[PDB]
Homo-oligomer: A and B are copies of this chain.
């Protein structure tokens, strides 16, 4: 390969990488909901806004 990884090393890294990325994104989602409960940051359209 160009990177020097074997097929099995590539598969192992891929599984760990996708797992880590999905866990990171999911905790981001949960954390963003908690923050919204602290500070709902997208305000509703105010009066006179167009």
Binding site for B on A (CB under 8 A): 2, 4, 38-39, 42-45, 50
Copies in the assembly, this chain? 4
Q: Is the interface of A mostly helix, strand, loop or mixed?
A: loop
Residue on B with the closest CB to A2? B4
- B-chain residues with CB within 8 Å of residue A43 when the two chains form the complex: 50
Query: How far in angstroms is the closest Cβ of chain B from A8?
Result: 14
Determine which of B2, B38, B39, B45 lies in contact with A39 in the assembled complex, contact meaning CB atoms within 8 Å. Answer: B45
A28 to B4, CA, bound (A): 36
Residue on B with the closest CB to A45? B39
A45 to B45, CA, bound (A): 19
- B-chain residues with CB within 8 Å of residue A42 when the two chains form the complex: 38
